[PDB]
Design a protein around this ligand. Structure first.
Ligand SMILES: *[C@H](C)[C@H]1/C(=C/c2[nH]c(/C=C3N=C(/C=C4\NC(=O)C(CC)=C4C)C(C)=C\3CCC(=O)O)c(CCC(=O)O)c2C)NC(=O)[C@@H]1C
Ligand SMILES: CCC1=C(C)/C(=C/C2=NC(=C\c3[nH]c(/C=C4\NC(=O)[C@H](C)[C@H]4CC)c(C)c3CCC(=O)O)/C(CCC(=O)O)=C2C)NC1=O
Lengths: 147, 149
């Protein structure tokens, strides 16, 4: 949020401070990378979601929907990574476990999500920097779902 | 802005296209470059305002306010550069010309504003692309102050 830093400093009749400028400088510097990551995760979304569903294959009853949802879970994660804002994951995963746990298995879902993390991480073996971003944003997705 | 792209992807329940992914790459590159310019103008604000002030001191009947306003102009410019939105300058310099011609001299203010532009630009000697940016935004600031009442 660049407009949000501005509206704060405006209120105090002041220039943006070093941290504020440094945080914004990084938000943009890391853009290229965050987008590289989202491109691979997308290009390989189907492979990734396959690995996750098979890992819990025998716990699934509606296959159409688990394949939908695992894909969605990955999609909102590519959103977050592109926006470099983990709150996107936080808002759409709100009260979602309560729904899934009625629908099928909450535990099965978490094991699947973990395999999504794994599968994603498998594409950044030569790039520890990117791996950390993928881990970070994935972890946020699993933790919000656990609640 | 990226939220803009993501939100209209979110409504089709789709991943981002490579087109959208590439238009986001440019946006980010521009943003980084703008923030490098804001850091410099902000780190060097005082130096930049003194030079502006010194260019017109003989005519100043209120040093504190003149310094303050000089600082306020540069301030809102970095606001605009950070956001990449020049309308921040249009909106906050509306009717500023009349207020200031009454308080002191509009002719003096313009000279001083020229010097802010000059001084700011002197931190980007080895960087034509950054200079173009600084210059566009400064020119907006000056233009909108020299608009009709
Ligand atoms: C004259 C050569 C110098 C000068 C003097 C000066 N200005 C004022 C009063 C005001 N100045 C402003 C300026 C701004 N307000 C803003 O929001 C911004 C950001 C873009 C600026 C630059 C305003 C709003 C006022 C009136 C409100 C107030 O008084 O605080 C005075 C006071 C005298 C008077 O009010 O009649 C003086 C002496 N300003 C210059 O820019 C010249 C360098
Ligand atoms: C983060 C983005 C996001 C997700 C994931 C999401 C899921 C989501 N899954 C749902 C249902 C469902 N979910 C599943 C099951 C599964 N789904 C899984 O992710 C598991 C792999 C598996 C069980 C563990 C089933 C079977 C239903 C249908 C429930 C029904 O028809 O009653 C519903 C109820 C509405 C609907 O039927 O579409 C939502 C909102 N919504 C979202 O906005």
């Amino acid at each position: 949020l660049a407009v949000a830093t501005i509206t704060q400093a405006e209120q105090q009749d002041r220039f943006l401070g070093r941290g504020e400028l440094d945080e914004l400088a990084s938000y943009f510097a890391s853009g290229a990378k965050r987008l590289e990551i989202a491109q691979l995760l997308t290009e390989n979304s189907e492979i990734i979601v396959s690995r996750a569903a098979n890992r819990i294959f025998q716990k699934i009853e509606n296959m159409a929907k688990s394949l939908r949802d695992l894909s969605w879970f990955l999609r909102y994660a590519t959103y977050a990574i592109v926006a470099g804002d983990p709150n996107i994951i936080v808002v759409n995963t709100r009260g979602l476990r309560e729904i899934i746990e009625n629908a099928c298995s909450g535990e099965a879902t978490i094991v699947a999500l973990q395999e999504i993390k794994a599968a994603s991480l498998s594409y950044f073996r030569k790039d520890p920097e990117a791996a950390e971003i993928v881990s970070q944003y994935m972890d946020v997705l699993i933790t919000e779902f656990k609640a």
